Design a protein around this ligand. Structure first.
Ligand SMILES: [Cl-]
Length: 345
RNA sequence: UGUAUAUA
């Protein structure tokens, strides 16, 4: 009845405080208008006891509020930085159903707010439950964000079980790299995990490099290997793409990998790619010229002109200068050479 | 002329 009154004439009730909600916290937190009063009060109130008064109502009904369209924000407000005195109780209120909450679209946002704010003992206490559903959680539309959040906010030694799940079986990393949600977990792992953890992960990627490099999601995983992997990792990749420059460049997704190699690679990595592009075939035309005729590889050669040194750019100009006549007669070849005209003068 | 990344 208290909520029914407050919805009708809200401005006629501008004195309402959180201590007045009392046993109405459930109806308020699950209401569109009610949950905001709670949130606005929690943010604007300077009284620690008013905010603590409803907290036992929050703990008592946490299991019902975490995956509510509106209640999930009320629970999140008590995970904020100025509420550390309440973290341990709130985690215990939800700890046993974390395996469920990881897959729910509202409750997962609460688990992320927890991992973002709480201290390491409680973080490990939440990953304790994610351990039970980790493989299925990595691929979930909701759960992958909880695994991503753990990788960013928890020290590498306490997310080792996530890495060992990537190395669960021989095909796990391929399975994850080609999954629209598991591939995001692999990238976060490449960004934040220790070299002893990322070296076996990058090891599995190399064995099925071609498939992953041309997958609509795995190509992002390969691009993250180039940037965050070792210098030898970039060598094995650049040597791989250099010897198969035409195949990698003329496919929709692996063409982005060659672009990533040019933006990240050192001078001699650029030299391997430029050398392979200008390597004259005895019975045909240089690879860079065929690449300019392709729907995808033409963006790769302009990337070369934008990224290589002047002497390597010099090598490219002496290679395709005899070929502009036959190049202009291919689809979009006029716009391609026009973007390249600043290099042909 | 060519690719992704969840809440009122
Ligand atoms: Cl859902």
């Amino acid at each position: 009845d208290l909520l029914t009154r407050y919805r009708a004439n809200p401005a006629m009730m501008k004195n309402l405080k959180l201590s007045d909600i009392r046993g109405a916290l459930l109806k308020f937190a699950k209401d569109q208008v009610g949950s905001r009063f709670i949130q606005q009060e929690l943010a604007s109130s300077k009284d620690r006891f008013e905010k603590d008064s409803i907290f036992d109502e929050v703990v008592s009904n946490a299991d019902e509020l975490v995956d509510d369209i509106f209640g999930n924000y009320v629970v999140q407000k008590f995970f904020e930085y100025g509420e550390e005195r309440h973290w341990a109780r709130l985690v215990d209120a939800i700890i046993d159903r974390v395996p469920e909450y990881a897959f729910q679209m509202y409750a997962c946002r609460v688990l992320q707010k927890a991992l973002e704010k709480i201290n390491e003992p409680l973080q490990i206490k939440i990953l304790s439950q994610i351990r039970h559903v980790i493989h299925r959680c990595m691929k979930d539309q909701n759960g992958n964000h909880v695994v991503q959040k753990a990788i960013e906010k928890v020290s590498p030694q306490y997310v080792q079980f996530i890495v060992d799940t990537l190395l669960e079986s021989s095909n796990t990393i391929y399975e994850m790299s080609v999954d629209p949600y598991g591939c995001r977990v692999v990238q976060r792992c490449l960004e934040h995990c220790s070299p002893s953890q990322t070296k076996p992960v990058i090891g599995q990627i190399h064995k099925r490099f071609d498939e992953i490099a041309n997958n609509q999601y795995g190509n992002y995983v390969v691009q993250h290997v180039i940037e965050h992997g070792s210098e030898e990792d970039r060598m094995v990749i650049v040597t791989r793409v250099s010897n198969n420059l035409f195949e990698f460049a003329t496919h929709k997704y692996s063409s982005n990998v060659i672009e990533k190699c040019l933006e990240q690679g050192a001078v001699y990595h650029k030299s391997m790619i430029v050398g392979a592009a200008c390597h004259h075939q005895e019975g045909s035309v240089p690879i860079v010229v065929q690449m300019m005729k392709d729907q995808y590889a033409n963006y790769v050669v302009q990337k070369m002109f934008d990224q290589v040194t002047s002497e390597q750019r010099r090598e490219l100009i002496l290679t395709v200068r005899p070929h502009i006549p036959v190049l202009r007669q291919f689809p979009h070849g006029k716009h391609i050479l026009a973007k390249l005209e600043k290099y042909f003068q």
